Amino acid sequence: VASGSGEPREEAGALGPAWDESQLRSYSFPTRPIPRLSQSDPRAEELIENEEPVVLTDTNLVYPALKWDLEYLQENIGNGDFSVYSASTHKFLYYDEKKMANFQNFKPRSNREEMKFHEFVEKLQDIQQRGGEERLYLQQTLNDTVGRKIVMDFLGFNWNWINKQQGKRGWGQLTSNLLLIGMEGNVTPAHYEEQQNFFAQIKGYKRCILFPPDQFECLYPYPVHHPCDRQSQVDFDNPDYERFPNFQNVVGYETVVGPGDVLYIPMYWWHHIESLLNGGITITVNFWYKGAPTPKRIEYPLKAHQKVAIMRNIEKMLGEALGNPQEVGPLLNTMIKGRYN
């Protein structure tokens, strides 16, 4: 019942288990499995409607990308610039560069380096070459500049299905598709997005651990003006229970996606994403959508994500009102101590 990702799935044509338990990292918290359903299954329609996660096994959302691999992409993706993140550890914490202004005591552990696709493949094979410890992760919005055959591939994605989805949910506009290419063992640590996300797995296997928005108290996001806004301050590998005591109460929904799977990551749901160990490279394309307009007007009791949105807006205005994001905390403290605690 704290199964996790369940027994590993058996590949078609007796090809043996897709992955195994020892490819998964181990954590301090328990998990229940996210359900894997067919896109035609009413229950999957329920889950998305109710903004609960679900793994859709047969959407064909990115059917033409399933052939993609580094050789094909290097060949066909064009000469555009690609954002590539570097790291010394397996954890790729991300930094909003616009926000680094107002936090000096903040040095990166993951630098963005712009480079052509072939320089990526090259760097990858230079590192592989000599068993170097360092790691990379390419993450780049698909756009205009992309080669003829990638565009045909892109156009062949299942727009009919995902557009119906956008329509049934009242979502706003598709904002971006991010292309993610990772090395085995890479972790994008726990964070949340404000958009809705269909996360479409193309190559390799990723374990995705999700936490609902009502676990805000257990996951301790950075301050909103901090560059790691929306990310957990907790190190999943070495959790500091003195600073983050509610982490001991955290409960995840967990799954492993492979080629053809689409994971619905609902708005404000925390997610932690790791490419399996010794699984090779992973490739994923996501689909971010705005999110249905806010209701006219509120109906109580508020949803967890609505309380989160409120906390964000309080922090923001207080940043503005005080003239300085650094004064947000002392003010809030002064507001609560001996008054509301």
Ligand X SMILES: O=C(O)CCC(=O)C(=O)O
Interface contacts to ligand X, rule CB under 6 A: 180, 188, 193, 197, 199, 271, 273, 284, 286
Q: In 130-215, which ranges are continuous DSSP H helix? A: 148-155, 159-168
Which residues 161-220 are close enough to bind a second copy by CB under 8 A? 216-217, 220
Inter-helix orientation angle 304-322/328-336, to 10°: 120
Return the one option of ligand X, a second copy, Zn ion, none that residue 251 interacts with (CB less than 5 to 8 A, by type). none
Return the one option of Zn ion, ligand X, a second copy, none that residue 199 interacts with (CB less than 5 to 8 A, by type). ligand X
**How many CA atoms are closer than 13 Å to the CA of 86, on its beta-carbon side?**
15
CB of 247 to a second copy, least distance (A): 9
Which residues 301-330 are close enough to bind a second copy by CB under 8 A? 301-302, 307, 310-311, 314-315, 317-318, 321-323, 328-329
Q: Does 253 bind a second copy (CB under 8 A)?
A: no
**Among 60-68, 103-111, 146-154, 298-306, the segment contacting a second copy (CB under 8 A):** 298-306
Nearest to 187 by CA among 246, 135, 226: 135
Q: Does 294 bind a second copy (CB under 8 A)?
A: no
Give, as one character, the DSSP assignment of residue 181. E
Q: How far apart are the first and last CA of the chain?
A: 36
CB of 231 to ligand X, least distance (A): 10
Q: Does 336 bind a second copy (CB under 8 A)?
A: yes
DSSP assignment of 122-150: HHHHHHHHTT---EEEEEEE--TT--HHH
Residue ranges with strand state E in the chain: 31-33, 36-37, 54-56, 82-87, 112-115, 135-141, 174-176, 178-182, 187-191, 196-203, 206-211, 252-257, 262-265, 270-275, 282-289
Cβ 143 vs Cβ 55: under 8 Å: no
CB of 217 to a second copy, least distance (A): 5
Convert residues 166-205 into a mask of x (bound to Zn ion by CB under 5 A) and - (unbound): ---------------------------x------------
- Residues lying near Zn ion in the complex (CB under 5 A) are found at 193
The footprint of a second copy (CB under 8 A) covers 216-217, 220-223, 233, 243-246, 298, 300-302, 307, 310-311, 314-315, 317-318, 321-323, 328-329, 331-341
